[PDB]
Enzyme design. Structure first.
Site, PDB file in Angstrom:
ATOM      1  N   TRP A  16     -11.048  -2.163   8.151  1.00 40.61           N
ATOM      2  CA  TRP A  16     -10.860  -1.947   6.726  1.00 40.61           C
ATOM      3  C   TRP A  16     -11.400  -3.077   5.861  1.00 40.61           C
ATOM      4  CZ3 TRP A  16     -10.665   2.802   5.806  1.00 40.61           C
ATOM      5  CH2 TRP A  16     -10.001   3.685   6.678  1.00 40.61           C
TER       6      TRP A  16
ATOM      7  N   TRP B  49      -4.178   5.656  -8.372  1.00 36.50           N
ATOM      8  CA  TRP B  49      -5.474   5.735  -7.707  1.00 36.50           C
ATOM      9  C   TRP B  49      -6.355   6.803  -8.350  1.00 36.50           C
ATOM     10  CZ3 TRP B  49      -5.325   5.625  -1.621  1.00 36.50           C
ATOM     11  CH2 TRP B  49      -4.427   4.627  -1.178  1.00 36.50           C
TER      12      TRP B  49
ATOM     13  N   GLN C  78       0.841  -1.196   0.000  1.00 35.02           N
ATOM     14  CA  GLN C  78       0.000   0.000   0.000  1.00 35.02           C
ATOM     15  C   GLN C  78       0.881   1.254   0.000  1.00 35.02           C
ATOM     16  OE1 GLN C  78      -1.267   2.721   1.556  1.00 35.02           O
ATOM     17  NE2 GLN C  78      -3.506   2.616   1.653  1.00 35.02           N
TER      18      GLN C  78
ATOM     19  N   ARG D  30     -21.061   5.984  -3.410  1.00 31.36           N
ATOM     20  CA  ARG D  30     -21.560   5.165  -2.307  1.00 31.36           C
ATOM     21  C   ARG D  30     -22.905   5.716  -1.848  1.00 31.36           C
ATOM     22  NH1 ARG D  30     -16.102   4.143   1.409  1.00 31.36           N
ATOM     23  NH2 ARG D  30     -15.044   2.739  -0.070  1.00 31.36           N
TER      24      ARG D  30
ATOM     25  N   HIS E   1      -2.214  -3.664   0.113  1.00 31.96           N
ATOM     26  CA  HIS E   1      -3.381  -2.960  -0.410  1.00 31.96           C
ATOM     27  C   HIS E   1      -4.325  -3.991  -1.039  1.00 31.96           C
ATOM     28  CE1 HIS E   1      -4.779   0.800  -2.913  1.00 31.96           C
ATOM     29  NE2 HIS E   1      -5.663   0.419  -2.009  1.00 31.96           N
TER      30      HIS E   1
ATOM     31  N   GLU F  88      -9.796  -5.711   3.212  1.00 33.46           N
ATOM     32  CA  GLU F  88      -8.367  -5.409   3.268  1.00 33.46           C
ATOM     33  C   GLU F  88      -7.768  -5.883   4.590  1.00 33.46           C
ATOM     34  OE1 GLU F  88      -6.475  -1.247   3.433  1.00 33.46           O
ATOM     35  OE2 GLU F  88      -6.225  -1.878   1.337  1.00 33.46           O
TER      36      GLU F  88
HETATM   37  O1  LIG Z   1     -20.533   0.345  -3.932  1.00 35.19           O
HETATM   38  C1  LIG Z   1     -19.503  -0.250  -4.239  1.00 35.19           C
HETATM   39  C2  LIG Z   1     -18.414  -0.603  -3.361  1.00 35.19           C
HETATM   40  C3  LIG Z   1     -17.346  -1.264  -3.868  1.00 35.19           C
HETATM   41  N1  LIG Z   1     -17.224  -1.638  -5.235  1.00 35.19           N
HETATM   42  C4  LIG Z   1     -16.013  -2.377  -5.745  1.00 35.19           C
HETATM   43  O2  LIG Z   1     -15.162  -2.766  -4.643  1.00 35.19           O
HETATM   44  C5  LIG Z   1     -13.871  -2.070  -4.714  1.00 35.19           C
HETATM   45  C6  LIG Z   1     -13.481  -1.615  -3.274  1.00 35.19           C
HETATM   46  O3  LIG Z   1     -14.053  -0.332  -3.055  1.00 35.19           O
HETATM   47  P1  LIG Z   1     -13.456   1.118  -3.003  1.00 35.19           P
HETATM   48  O4  LIG Z   1     -12.635   1.317  -4.225  1.00 35.19           O
HETATM   49  O5  LIG Z   1     -14.612   2.066  -2.790  1.00 35.19           O
HETATM   50  O6  LIG Z   1     -12.505   1.000  -1.743  1.00 35.19           O
HETATM   51  P2  LIG Z   1     -11.362   2.011  -1.275  1.00 35.19           P
HETATM   52  O7  LIG Z   1     -10.133   1.718  -2.285  1.00 35.19           O
HETATM   53  O8  LIG Z   1     -11.700   3.425  -1.567  1.00 35.19           O
HETATM   54  O9  LIG Z   1     -11.081   1.582   0.121  1.00 35.19           O
HETATM   55  C7  LIG Z   1     -14.138  -0.919  -5.703  1.00 35.19           C
HETATM   56  O10 LIG Z   1     -12.955  -0.549  -6.418  1.00 35.19           O
HETATM   57  C8  LIG Z   1     -15.097  -1.573  -6.692  1.00 35.19           C
HETATM   58  O11 LIG Z   1     -14.457  -2.422  -7.633  1.00 35.19           O
HETATM   59  C9  LIG Z   1     -18.249  -1.319  -6.129  1.00 35.19           C
HETATM   60  O12 LIG Z   1     -18.201  -1.616  -7.329  1.00 35.19           O
HETATM   61  N2  LIG Z   1     -19.340  -0.640  -5.592  1.00 35.19           N
END
Ligand SMILES: O=c1ccn([C@@H]2O[C@H](COP(=O)(O)OP(=O)(O)O)[C@@H](O)[C@H]2O)c(=O)[nH]1
Ligand SMILES: [Mn+2]
Length: 287
Positions: free
Chosen positions: A233, A275, A166, A284, A199, A236
């Protein structure tokens, strides 16, 4: 047949961690000989898979950019199959793919909480590996959709089990890592333990290994639900617990998943993936 020294030269990057205590290499820009690996894998006629989930507005916000960049940079020179999991196929952005790229789309159920959408990926990926991915590819990578490939992400990243360092914690000490610290959770990692903070946006390996990674992580996720607790988390936290117990045979440097918000320090020589800015207010719909 292939030996680590055949393609990996840790001395090219002396200022960073290039080898783990368990002898797994940490792949940094400059340490790998892709030409040697391409020839080696090309002779074995391997195919590499890549799973990506896009549920809800993540589709419109990030799927096209992800797929377009993947088509251009992921395992170029080798057959690749993109496995796209979306909750609404009608919103699937069908882009034109290039030589050696192909794909297939699957309609999945959208979980109520985004936390479960992210965690359910572990169950889903496993089911697909058993159902077909195990028969279609030699290596598989599972990635978040909210990122974009910036340069060649090739065969130098392949391995039995692959983990991603990460970007914010690669230089920190374990006791500073954001592991789940509550003993009540299956993802618990006590202070005084831990190798790195991985990560969950990128992880892979052979279908057999990814199946175990995903199966064990989901078992932990389900267990916590029965004990009325949810890892800080989410997946993760569980992934980190898994990689502590089952060390990855290969680790990727932050160059393979960088956050430009940090800037671009000396250690990051060539970014392969970056990112996407967070947009939770829109993508969300809960907590
Ligand atoms: O409502 C949601 C939540 C999660 N994801 C999928 O699950 C991964 C993990 O979520 P996110 O990227 O929001 O996590 P962060 O990296 O911000 O912790 C995302 O990249 C998406 O591929 C999605 O498609 N819809
Ligand atoms: Mn993400």
């Amino acid at each position: 047949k292939l030996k680590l020294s055949d393609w990996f030269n840790p001395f090219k990057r002396p200022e960073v961690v290039t080898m783990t205590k368990w002898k797994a290499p940490v792949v940094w820009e400059g340490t790998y000989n892709r030409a040697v690996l391409d020839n080696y894998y090309a002779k074995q006629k391997i195919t590499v898979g890549l799973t990506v989930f896009a549920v809800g507005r993540y589709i419109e916000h990030y799927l096209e950019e992800f797929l377009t960049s993947a088509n251009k940079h992921f395992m170029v020179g080798h057959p690749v199959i993109f496995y796209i999991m979306v909750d609404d196929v009608s919103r699937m952005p069908l882009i034109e793919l290039g030589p050696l790229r192909s794909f297939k789309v699957f309609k999945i159920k959208p979980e109520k909480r985004w936390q479960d959408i992210s965690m359910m990926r572990m169950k889903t990926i496993g089911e697909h590996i058993v159902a077909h991915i195990q028969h279609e590819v030699d290596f598989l990578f599972c990635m978040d959709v909210d990122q974009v490939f910036q340069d060649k992400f090739g065969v130098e990243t392949l391995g039995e089990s692959v983990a991603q360092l990460q970007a914010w914690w690669y230089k920190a000490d374990p006791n500073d890592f954001t592991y789940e610290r509550r003993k009540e959770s299956a993802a618990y990692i006590p202070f005084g333990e831990g190798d790195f903070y991985y990560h969950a946006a990128i992880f892979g390996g052979t279908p057999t290994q990814v199946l175990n990674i995903t199966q064990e992580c989901f078992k932990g996720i389900l267990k916590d639900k029965k004990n009325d607790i949810e890892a800080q988390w989410h997946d993760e936290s569980h992934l980190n617990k898994y990689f502590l117990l089952n060390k990855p045979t290969k680790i990727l440097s932050p160059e393979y998943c960088w956050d430009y918000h940090i800037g671009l320090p000396a250690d990051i020589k060539l970014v392969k993936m970056s990112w996407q800015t967070k947009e939770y207010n829109v993508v969300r719909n809960n907590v």
